[PDB]
Write a protein that binds this ligand. Structure first.
Ligand SMILES: CCn1cc(-c2cccc(C(F)(F)F)c2)c2sc(/C(N)=N/C3CCS(=O)(=O)CC3)cc2c1=O
Length: 114
């Protein structure tokens, strides 16, 4: 079964993945679909890998989850040119998670759960 932190992270993940309806961020980027990806991007990340990590209870904190989320977005903005769908979508998703998981919103959540 599940734990409170897992339920919270699943919620954040679900809200974020809704902004990627075509699934560009859904599973690991292959070298076949992105030439040279593994050369340029040393630490790949995607929503599916993150979900698996939530299920395995690997995130000890929201900070650890936010780090992988930011990594996924940063990889897409690093490997792709600014005028691409991937870069623009990564920037939109990053802004959404930054707002959703802000320190201020997390403080308020903490206060409600005291
Ligand atoms: C956002 C993660 N991600 C995902 C893909 C991707 C994955 C599965 C399926 C598809 C597709 F079928 F819709 F094409 C794309 C790709 S593909 C790709 C790719 N070939 N990017 C090039 C775009 C033009 S460029 O910026 O000049 C050079 C990199 C980058 C990513 C990516 O970061």
């Amino acid at each position: 079964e599940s734990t409170p932190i897992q339920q919270l992270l699943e919620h954040f993940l679900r809200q974020l993945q809704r902004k990627d309806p075509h699934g560009f961020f859904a599973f690991p980027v292959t070298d076949a679909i992105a030439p040279g990806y593994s050369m340029i991007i040393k630490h790949p990340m995607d929503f599916g890998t993150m979900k698996d990590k939530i299920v395995a209870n690997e995130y000890k904190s929201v900070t650890e989850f936010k780090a992988d989320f930011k990594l996924m977005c940063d990889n897409a903005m690093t490997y792709n040119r600014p005028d691409t769908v991937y870069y623009k979508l990564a920037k939109k998703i990053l802004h959404a998670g930054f707002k959703m998981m802000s320190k201020e919103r997390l403080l308020a959540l903490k206060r409600s759960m005291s």
